[PDB]
Design a binder for this molecule. Structure first.
Ligand SMILES: Cc1cc2nc3c(=O)[nH]c(=O)nc-3n(C[C@H](O)[C@H](O)[C@H](O)COP(=O)(O)O)c2cc1C
Ligand SMILES: Cc1cc2nc3c(=O)[nH]c(=O)nc-3n(C[C@H](O)[C@H](O)[C@H](O)COP(=O)(O)O)c2cc1C
Lengths: 226, 211
């Protein structure tokens, strides 16, 4: 099955929801399991109290735990349950105020309270494919005035890439505030070609996710010594 | 007055609360208008629904806004009020899961929905002194396997330094899990020696804040 996490708060005007939708159409089209499990933290955020309670329970004989502590670690397990149930991941995290979504950080903070996701434990997701959909208002690449101002990209890549050891495909649509903020009207055409191109890339990542089981069984080089 | 923010969820065991007191002690003791307004997002988190509500309200005509939409923009205005009202700032944010405190970003997200904090407007806090107390369980210095693995320090510096234009002094304690993680006993005395140093760095910051 595919697991889909949306974190956008802008509803129907969401670039990330729209790009993720194009990825999902491709999954359902070519995937052996077109099934999709979804969670929308943007509409249904995880409460801001449950993390602290889980961190406390984490080292307490389960019986000496308190109502909120237990309910907190139970919820952590349900969220891990969803990730370990999916053969592939679609995670849509837009750029807000130069950093991580409050909703994405919350979700990840609480996941990492579940024993199966602690530190030093082997990721139960290693090798599994993930498409990450981000968008930005302005342009953030090398040589722009906003180079190194996306403090989110690197964090999500360390968690999904280096910690969870997921196989990561990234779809970034920059210039989503072009036509919205006049100060970016020197970008009108660039912004358009960017959109069309990243729409294909979102279609592309969906096709590639769908076929990853096949592509792994067709893989022969396994670096045995010789 | 002094404005103090805590984000720690560790209570009695916080390295950042401990270090932040050292700054505040220097304030109250040797500072004029020595009053201290404080807010502990670790004990009293801002609701997780309030940022979206404030962002959405700005698209609904004012005359027809929903109480929850009006209520969120009021709360944003009150957190801005706190900051605009202080001569100095004391902001304590630990490193959590390689990234930013979930509560610090919510607070910053909802601050920036107020029209005084908005893009294109001048920082109403520009030039104001600010001490940032942060702590790490590991060592994230140049030359270490964990270099570039603190994705928080850069982001807080962008908001507080580059957007808010505060004259920002950072006090940072590392190796806060030496003694808790058995695999760090190779640092028992170094760990202790960074503690006493950052404590004195914390007292230093206080004095110059009070000056
Ligand atoms: C509260 C808020 C903060 C934003 N912060 C940034 C920012 O720091 N940098 C940026 O390039 N765009 C920023 N944007 C613009 C968004 O990145 C853009 O609207 C993007 O499409 C958001 O994804 P979504 O539409 O799927 O929610 C922000 C938008 C909002 C509503
Ligand atoms: C949920 C959680 C996540 C943490 N993640 C990290 C981390 O990614 N890197 C690190 O060096 N320390 C990490 N630590 C340890 C903290 O850096 C250390 O405990 C610090 O002193 C916390 O600040 P506080 O005591 O003021 O809350 C983490 C601690 C907790 C409770």
């Amino acid at each position: 099955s595919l697991f889909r996490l949306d974190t956008s708060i802008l509803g129907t005007r969401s670039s990330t929801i729209a790009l993720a939708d194009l990825v999902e159409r491709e999954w359902r089209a070519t995937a052996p399991d077109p099934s999709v499990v979804r969670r929308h933290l943007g509409e249904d955020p995880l409460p801001a109290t449950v993390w602290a309670a889980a961190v406390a329970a984490q080292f307490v004989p389960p019986a000496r735990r308190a109502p909120e502590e237990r309910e907190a670690l139970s919820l952590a397990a349900a969220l891990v349950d969803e990730l370990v149930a999916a053969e592939a991941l679609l995670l849509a995290a837009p750029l807000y105020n130069f950093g991580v979504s409050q909703h994405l950080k919350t979700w990840v903070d609480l996941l990492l309270t579940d024993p199966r996701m602690a530190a030093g434990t082997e990721s139960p997701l290693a090798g599994r494919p993930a498409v990450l959909v981000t968008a930005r208002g302005g342009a953030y690449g090398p040589g722009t005035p906003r180079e190194g101002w996306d403090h989110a990209i690197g964090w999500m890549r360390r968690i999904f890439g280096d910690v969870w050891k997921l196989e990561l495909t990234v779809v970034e649509r920059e210039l989503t505030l072009v036509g919205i903020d006049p100060a970016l009207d020197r970008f009108k055409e660039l912004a358009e070609r960017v959109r069309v191109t990243t729409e294909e890339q979102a279609r592309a990542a969906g096709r590639r996710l769908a076929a990853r089981e096949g592509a792994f069984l067709a893989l022969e080089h396994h670096h045995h010594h010789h």
